[PDB]
């Protein structure tokens, strides 16, 4: 009896190649027909390439230009050549022959099946953060398993996860602060964590509380992250305790040509813990103070991150208000810097928000178990945080065993002096809409169209 027998169904990469082949127990040349059928889990079988006897072949539209079906009929063996593959490639392969018999009738043959995976393990985390140390790990993990890793970092991501991973594939797992967790969880867009209790144990007790959304564990804890007072410390070496004694130190530097302080002012994140600092009361007290700044010109109406950062690295501006990540780009430049607890305000301290960076699977991904793998054996590891922090700073890390490095860092001290200072952002689905009505009121008091009593008016409703 004559019998098919796939072989070269593997692993690879999207762009990467296979050869599958399919022998026969018997000569091609009395098939009429040989062809290659996929089918991937839960769809109906689907025709890719065929050559006839007659040596013409045929191909379907999505394989079409990539792959090539061959023929060798000493080897007595149908080749598939899958060049620049595809995820939507991924399926079970089989070999087929139709034979036409001496008389009308004919004979379809079929095989035991190739598996071929195209897997690609992609990650989006925020441009400001250590992606190529990320990638680092990633190749890592390539090395270990055979996995691709690409990391990437669009912009407004964490607002553009939540509408293409709902329709789109998007990415497998999500890099952001722990606060807008909550509004993923609650539309379905995350998957459940469930880690063993010896990786549980790795981590503070703490930092699993600020991943939780109704008793469910969304994400894995990665760093706690907290504003400080980022200052030269050869243009201030006494730098403000207080806010209110700035405007004093900027009419100083003014005359020297510089500035005193430039930071995002465009981001609610970097206002609000001038604007909490008091507290409402603390909210206009606070916010009016920053509207003054900016009305006696001693900040830019538009100061985003990119004019702020490079202002304080070139040596432009004595003060900038950034968290860990910002480091690396200042040690790069030639400042002796520093970085202090936040300046402040009507006595009372400025409270900023302190966000936990975590690792969250995407819901509509197939590689969930295989990201589990990385984000737990890979990055939430001694060698893994090692590699994106030397990078860019990740804060004050949720790895245990980090504790004594961490406390052997001055600006690490300074960043836990501020997160105690500030509190752990609710995760609640309502933060988006929340950071949504203080970035406009921010931006309409600073810019000068709506009232500081009218801004925190449509910002309450
Ligand atoms: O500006 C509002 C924005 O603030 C926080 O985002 C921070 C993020 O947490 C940091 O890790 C860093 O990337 O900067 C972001 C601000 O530029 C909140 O996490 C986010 O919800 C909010 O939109």
């Known amino acids: 009896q004559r019998q098919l027998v796939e072989s070269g169904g593997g692993l690879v990469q999207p762009g990467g190649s296979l050869r599958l082949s399919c022998a026969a127990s018997?000569?091609?040349?009395?098939?009429?027909?040989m062809g290659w059928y996929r089918q991937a889990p839960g769809k109906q079988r689907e025709l890719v390439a065929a050559?006839?006897?007659?040596?013409?072949?045929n191909y379907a539209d999505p394989v079409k230009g990539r792959f090539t079906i061959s023929r060798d009929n000493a080897k007595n063996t149908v080749y598939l050549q899958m060049n620049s593959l595809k995820p939507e490639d991924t399926a079970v392969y089989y070999c087929?022959?139709?034979?036409?018999?001496?008389?009308?009738?004919?004979?379809?043959?079929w095989g035991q099946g190739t598996p071929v995976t195209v897997v690609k393990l992609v990650i989006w985390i925020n441009g400001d953060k250590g992606y190529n140390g990320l990638a680092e790990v990633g190749k890592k993990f390539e090395k270990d398993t055979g996995i691709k890793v690409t990391v990437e970092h669009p912009d407004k991501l964490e607002e553009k996860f939540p509408q293409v991973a709902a329709t789109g594939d998007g990415p497998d797992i999500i890099f952001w602060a722990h606060d807008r967790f909550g509004g993923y969880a609650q539309s379905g867009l995350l998957a459940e964590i469930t880690p063993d209790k010896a990786f549980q144990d790795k981590l503070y007790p703490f930092t699993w509380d600020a991943v939780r959304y109704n008793g469910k564990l969304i994400a894995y804890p990665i760093a706690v992250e907290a504003l400080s007072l980022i200052y030269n410390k050869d243009l201030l070496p006494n730098p403000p305790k207080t806010w209110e004694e700035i405007p004093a130190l900027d009419k100083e530097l003014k005359a020297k040509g510089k500035s005193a302080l430039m930071f995002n002012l465009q981001e609610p994140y970097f206002t609000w813990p001038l604007i909490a600092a008091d507290g409402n009361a603390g909210a206009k007290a606070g916010l009016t103070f920053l509207v003054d700044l900016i009305k006696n010109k001693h900040m830019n109406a538009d100061t985003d991150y990119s004019i702020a950062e490079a202002a304080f690295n070139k040596g432009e501006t004595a003060m900038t208000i950034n968290g860990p990540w910002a480091w690396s780009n200042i040690d790069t430049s030639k400042v002796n810097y520093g970085v202090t607890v936040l300046p402040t305000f009507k006595g009372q301290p400025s409270k900023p928000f302190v966000g936990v960076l975590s690792a969250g699977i995407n819901a509509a991904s197939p590689n969930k178990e295989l990201a589990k793998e990385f984000l737990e054996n890979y990055l939430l590891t001694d060698e893994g945080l090692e590699a994106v922090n030397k990078d860019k700073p990740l804060g004050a890390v949720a790895l245990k065993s980090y504790e004594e490095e961490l406390a052997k860092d001055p600006r690490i001290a300074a960043t836990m002096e501020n997160a105690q200072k500030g509190e752990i952002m609710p995760n609640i689905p309502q933060m988006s809409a929340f950071w949504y009505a203080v970035r406009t009121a921010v931006i309409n008091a600073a810019s000068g169209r709506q009232t500081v009593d009218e801004a925190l008016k449509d910002a309450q409703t």
């Open positions: 087929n022959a139709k034979e036409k018999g001496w008389s009308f009738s004919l004979y379809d043959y």
């Open positions: 018997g000569s091609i040349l009395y098939f009429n027909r």
């Open positions: 050559i006839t006897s007659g040596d013409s072949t």
